[PDB]
mmCIF file of all heavy atoms in Angstrom:
data_model
loop_
_atom_site.group_PDB
_atom_site.id
_atom_site.type_symbol
_atom_site.label_atom_id
_atom_site.label_comp_id
_atom_site.label_asym_id
_atom_site.label_seq_id
_atom_site.Cartn_x
_atom_site.Cartn_y
_atom_site.Cartn_z
ATOM 1 N N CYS A 1 0.916 -1.126 0.000
ATOM 2 C CA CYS A 1 0.000 0.000 0.000
ATOM 3 C C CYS A 1 0.956 1.175 0.000
ATOM 4 O O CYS A 1 1.647 1.412 0.978
ATOM 5 C CB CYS A 1 -0.871 0.025 1.252
ATOM 6 S SG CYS A 1 -2.164 1.291 1.140
ATOM 7 N N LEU A 2 1.004 1.907 -1.105
ATOM 8 C CA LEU A 2 1.944 3.011 -1.226
ATOM 9 C C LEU A 2 1.303 4.337 -1.533
ATOM 10 O O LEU A 2 0.212 4.395 -2.089
ATOM 11 C CB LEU A 2 2.937 2.717 -2.351
ATOM 12 C CG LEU A 2 3.564 1.326 -2.390
ATOM 13 C CD1 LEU A 2 4.025 1.015 -3.807
ATOM 14 C CD2 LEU A 2 4.708 1.254 -1.391
ATOM 15 N N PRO A 3 1.987 5.431 -1.179
ATOM 16 C CA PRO A 3 1.474 6.773 -1.443
ATOM 17 C C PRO A 3 1.359 6.868 -2.958
ATOM 18 O O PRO A 3 2.260 6.452 -3.671
ATOM 19 C CB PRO A 3 2.574 7.667 -0.896
ATOM 20 C CG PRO A 3 3.106 6.864 0.251
ATOM 21 C CD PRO A 3 3.196 5.484 -0.339
ATOM 22 N N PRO A 4 0.254 7.412 -3.470
ATOM 23 C CA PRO A 4 0.061 7.534 -4.920
ATOM 24 C C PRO A 4 1.284 7.971 -5.732
ATOM 25 O O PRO A 4 1.505 7.470 -6.840
ATOM 26 C CB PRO A 4 -1.087 8.530 -5.028
ATOM 27 C CG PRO A 4 -1.900 8.199 -3.830
ATOM 28 C CD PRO A 4 -0.848 8.062 -2.744
ATOM 29 N N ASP A 5 2.076 8.893 -5.192
ATOM 30 C CA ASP A 5 3.249 9.374 -5.906
ATOM 31 C C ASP A 5 4.464 8.464 -5.841
ATOM 32 O O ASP A 5 5.535 8.832 -6.324
ATOM 33 C CB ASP A 5 3.653 10.756 -5.406
ATOM 34 C CG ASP A 5 2.703 11.835 -5.851
ATOM 35 O OD1 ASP A 5 2.011 11.642 -6.873
ATOM 36 O OD2 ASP A 5 2.665 12.888 -5.185
ATOM 37 N N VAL A 6 4.304 7.287 -5.253
ATOM 38 C CA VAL A 6 5.406 6.346 -5.134
ATOM 39 C C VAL A 6 5.121 5.066 -5.891
ATOM 40 O O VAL A 6 6.034 4.419 -6.381
ATOM 41 C CB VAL A 6 5.666 5.995 -3.671
ATOM 42 C CG1 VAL A 6 6.632 4.840 -3.572
ATOM 43 C CG2 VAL A 6 6.208 7.207 -2.949
ATOM 44 N N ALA A 7 3.851 4.704 -5.991
ATOM 45 C CA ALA A 7 3.449 3.487 -6.682
ATOM 46 C C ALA A 7 3.852 3.497 -8.143
ATOM 47 O O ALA A 7 3.950 4.556 -8.751
ATOM 48 C CB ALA A 7 1.944 3.307 -6.568
ATOM 49 N N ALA A 8 4.068 2.309 -8.699
ATOM 50 C CA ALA A 8 4.455 2.158 -10.097
ATOM 51 C C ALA A 8 3.367 2.713 -10.986
ATOM 52 O O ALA A 8 3.642 3.236 -12.061
ATOM 53 C CB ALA A 8 4.693 0.697 -10.425
ATOM 54 N N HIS A 9 2.126 2.587 -10.532
ATOM 55 C CA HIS A 9 0.967 3.095 -11.259
ATOM 56 C C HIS A 9 0.060 3.761 -10.241
ATOM 57 O O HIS A 9 -0.051 3.295 -9.119
ATOM 58 C CB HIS A 9 0.188 1.962 -11.924
ATOM 59 C CG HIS A 9 0.990 1.153 -12.889
ATOM 60 N ND1 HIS A 9 1.623 1.704 -13.981
ATOM 61 C CD2 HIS A 9 1.218 -0.181 -12.958
ATOM 62 C CE1 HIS A 9 2.203 0.747 -14.682
ATOM 63 N NE2 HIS A 9 1.971 -0.407 -14.083
ATOM 64 N N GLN A 10 -0.588 4.846 -10.625
ATOM 65 C CA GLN A 10 -1.486 5.525 -9.712
ATOM 66 C C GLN A 10 -2.902 5.055 -9.974
ATOM 67 O O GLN A 10 -3.728 4.999 -9.074
ATOM 68 C CB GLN A 10 -1.396 7.029 -9.916
ATOM 69 C CG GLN A 10 -0.007 7.560 -9.670
ATOM 70 C CD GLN A 10 0.142 8.983 -10.119
ATOM 71 O OE1 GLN A 10 -0.310 9.349 -11.201
ATOM 72 N NE2 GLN A 10 0.793 9.797 -9.301
ATOM 73 N N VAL A 11 -3.171 4.691 -11.217
ATOM 74 C CA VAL A 11 -4.491 4.243 -11.603
ATOM 75 C C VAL A 11 -4.399 3.074 -12.567
ATOM 76 O O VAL A 11 -3.857 3.214 -13.660
ATOM 77 C CB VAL A 11 -5.274 5.390 -12.300
ATOM 78 C CG1 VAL A 11 -6.629 4.898 -12.767
ATOM 79 C CG2 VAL A 11 -5.439 6.566 -11.354
ATOM 80 N N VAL A 12 -4.919 1.921 -12.165
ATOM 81 C CA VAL A 12 -4.929 0.759 -13.045
ATOM 82 C C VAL A 12 -6.376 0.554 -13.502
ATOM 83 O O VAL A 12 -7.274 0.417 -12.681
ATOM 84 C CB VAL A 12 -4.408 -0.506 -12.324
ATOM 85 C CG1 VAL A 12 -5.107 -0.672 -11.001
ATOM 86 C CG2 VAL A 12 -4.630 -1.732 -13.191
ATOM 87 N N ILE A 13 -6.603 0.566 -14.812
ATOM 88 C CA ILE A 13 -7.946 0.383 -15.354
ATOM 89 C C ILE A 13 -8.226 -1.082 -15.653
ATOM 90 O O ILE A 13 -7.516 -1.709 -16.440
ATOM 91 C CB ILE A 13 -8.137 1.157 -16.665
ATOM 92 C CG1 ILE A 13 -7.907 2.646 -16.443
ATOM 93 C CG2 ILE A 13 -9.541 0.938 -17.186
ATOM 94 C CD1 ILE A 13 -8.001 3.450 -17.718
ATOM 95 N N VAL A 14 -9.268 -1.625 -15.035
ATOM 96 C CA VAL A 14 -9.622 -3.021 -15.256
ATOM 97 C C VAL A 14 -10.986 -3.146 -15.921
ATOM 98 O O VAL A 14 -12.017 -2.894 -15.296
ATOM 99 C CB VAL A 14 -9.668 -3.813 -13.933
ATOM 100 C CG1 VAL A 14 -9.988 -5.275 -14.220
ATOM 101 C CG2 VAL A 14 -8.345 -3.686 -13.193
ATOM 102 N N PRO A 15 -11.013 -3.528 -17.204
ATOM 103 C CA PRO A 15 -12.288 -3.674 -17.904
ATOM 104 C C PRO A 15 -12.931 -5.022 -17.584
ATOM 105 O O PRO A 15 -12.258 -6.055 -17.604
ATOM 106 C CB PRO A 15 -11.882 -3.562 -19.365
ATOM 107 C CG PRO A 15 -10.576 -4.264 -19.370
ATOM 108 C CD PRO A 15 -9.889 -3.685 -18.141
ATOM 109 N N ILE A 16 -14.229 -4.992 -17.276
ATOM 110 C CA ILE A 16 -14.996 -6.196 -16.961
ATOM 111 C C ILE A 16 -15.757 -6.598 -18.218
ATOM 112 O O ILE A 16 -16.538 -5.803 -18.750
ATOM 113 C CB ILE A 16 -16.019 -5.934 -15.850
ATOM 114 C CG1 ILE A 16 -15.364 -5.172 -14.696
ATOM 115 C CG2 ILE A 16 -16.582 -7.258 -15.362
ATOM 116 C CD1 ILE A 16 -14.274 -5.940 -13.982
ATOM 117 N N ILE A 17 -15.541 -7.827 -18.684
ATOM 118 C CA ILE A 17 -16.184 -8.293 -19.911
ATOM 119 C C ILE A 17 -16.524 -9.783 -19.938
ATOM 120 O O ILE A 17 -15.742 -10.621 -19.480
ATOM 121 C CB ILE A 17 -15.282 -7.979 -21.139
ATOM 122 C CG1 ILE A 17 -15.168 -6.465 -21.326
ATOM 123 C CG2 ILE A 17 -15.834 -8.645 -22.396
ATOM 124 C CD1 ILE A 17 -14.162 -6.053 -22.372
ATOM 125 N N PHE A 18 -17.697 -10.097 -20.486
ATOM 126 C CA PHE A 18 -18.162 -11.473 -20.620
ATOM 127 C C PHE A 18 -18.778 -11.677 -22.003
ATOM 128 O O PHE A 18 -19.802 -12.349 -22.137
ATOM 129 C CB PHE A 18 -19.242 -11.811 -19.589
ATOM 130 C CG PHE A 18 -18.816 -11.656 -18.167
ATOM 131 C CD1 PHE A 18 -18.989 -10.445 -17.506
ATOM 132 C CD2 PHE A 18 -18.291 -12.735 -17.470
ATOM 133 C CE1 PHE A 18 -18.650 -10.316 -16.169
ATOM 134 C CE2 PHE A 18 -17.948 -12.616 -16.132
ATOM 135 C CZ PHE A 18 -18.129 -11.405 -15.479
ATOM 136 N N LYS A 19 -18.178 -11.094 -23.032
ATOM 137 C CA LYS A 19 -18.713 -11.246 -24.386
ATOM 138 C C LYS A 19 -20.080 -10.559 -24.475
ATOM 139 O O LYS A 19 -21.059 -11.159 -24.918
ATOM 140 C CB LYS A 19 -18.859 -12.738 -24.719
ATOM 141 C CG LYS A 19 -17.694 -13.590 -24.223
ATOM 142 C CD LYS A 19 -18.020 -15.074 -24.272
ATOM 143 C CE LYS A 19 -16.955 -15.895 -23.553
ATOM 144 N NZ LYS A 19 -17.287 -17.348 -23.548
ATOM 145 N N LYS A 20 -20.137 -9.302 -24.046
ATOM 146 C CA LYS A 20 -21.374 -8.528 -24.067
ATOM 147 C C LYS A 20 -21.045 -7.042 -24.137
ATOM 148 O O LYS A 20 -20.843 -6.399 -23.110
ATOM 149 C CB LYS A 20 -22.192 -8.798 -22.803
ATOM 150 C CG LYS A 20 -22.448 -10.266 -22.515
ATOM 151 C CD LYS A 20 -23.332 -10.442 -21.292
ATOM 152 C CE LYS A 20 -23.628 -11.909 -21.043
ATOM 153 N NZ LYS A 20 -24.661 -12.078 -19.989
ATOM 154 N N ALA A 21 -21.000 -6.502 -25.351
ATOM 155 C CA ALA A 21 -20.683 -5.091 -25.566
ATOM 156 C C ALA A 21 -19.195 -4.868 -25.330
ATOM 157 O O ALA A 21 -18.750 -3.739 -25.122
ATOM 158 C CB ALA A 21 -21.501 -4.211 -24.628
ATOM 159 N N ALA A 22 -18.439 -5.962 -25.370
ATOM 160 C CA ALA A 22 -16.998 -5.937 -25.161
ATOM 161 C C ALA A 22 -16.316 -4.832 -25.955
ATOM 162 O O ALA A 22 -15.674 -3.954 -25.385
ATOM 163 C CB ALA A 22 -16.400 -7.287 -25.530
ATOM 164 N N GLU A 23 -16.461 -4.876 -27.275
ATOM 165 C CA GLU A 23 -15.851 -3.880 -28.149
ATOM 166 C C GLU A 23 -16.124 -2.456 -27.674
ATOM 167 O O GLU A 23 -15.375 -1.534 -27.994
ATOM 168 C CB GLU A 23 -16.373 -4.044 -29.580
ATOM 169 C CG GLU A 23 -16.148 -5.430 -30.175
ATOM 170 C CD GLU A 23 -16.741 -5.580 -31.574
ATOM 171 O OE1 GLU A 23 -17.976 -5.429 -31.724
ATOM 172 O OE2 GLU A 23 -15.970 -5.851 -32.523
ATOM 173 N N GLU A 24 -17.194 -2.283 -26.908
ATOM 174 C CA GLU A 24 -17.569 -0.969 -26.405
ATOM 175 C C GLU A 24 -16.964 -0.692 -25.044
ATOM 176 O O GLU A 24 -16.642 0.447 -24.721
ATOM 177 C CB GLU A 24 -19.082 -0.868 -26.317
ATOM 178 C CG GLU A 24 -19.768 -1.245 -27.604
ATOM 179 C CD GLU A 24 -21.269 -1.150 -27.497
ATOM 180 O OE1 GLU A 24 -21.776 -0.025 -27.286
ATOM 181 O OE2 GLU A 24 -21.937 -2.201 -27.617
ATOM 182 N N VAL A 25 -16.830 -1.737 -24.238
ATOM 183 C CA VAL A 25 -16.240 -1.588 -22.917
ATOM 184 C C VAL A 25 -14.777 -1.241 -23.144
ATOM 185 O O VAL A 25 -14.267 -0.274 -22.587
ATOM 186 C CB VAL A 25 -16.346 -2.897 -22.092
ATOM 187 C CG1 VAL A 25 -15.635 -2.736 -20.760
ATOM 188 C CG2 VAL A 25 -17.807 -3.248 -21.858
ATOM 189 N N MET A 26 -14.115 -2.026 -23.990
ATOM 190 C CA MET A 26 -12.714 -1.799 -24.299
ATOM 191 C C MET A 26 -12.440 -0.393 -24.792
ATOM 192 O O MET A 26 -11.686 0.339 -24.166
ATOM 193 C CB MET A 26 -12.225 -2.805 -25.331
ATOM 194 C CG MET A 26 -11.759 -4.095 -24.706
ATOM 195 S SD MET A 26 -10.508 -3.783 -23.443
ATOM 196 C CE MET A 26 -10.311 -5.443 -22.747
#
């Protein structure tokens, strides 16, 4: 658990998909 300015990434985006509007979620 690191201070935002120290972490390798501050924001990691995780797309949730099950073959339903995928091309749009991405």
Side-chain angles (χ1 to χ4, degrees):
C1 188
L2 314 156
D5 288 336
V6 170
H9 301 302
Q10 300 169 316
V11 177
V12 50
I13 301 177
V14 182
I16 313 296
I17 294 172
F18 301 90
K19 319 166 190 178
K20 307 183 178 189
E23 303 177 299
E24 308 180 64
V25 176
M26 274 306 173

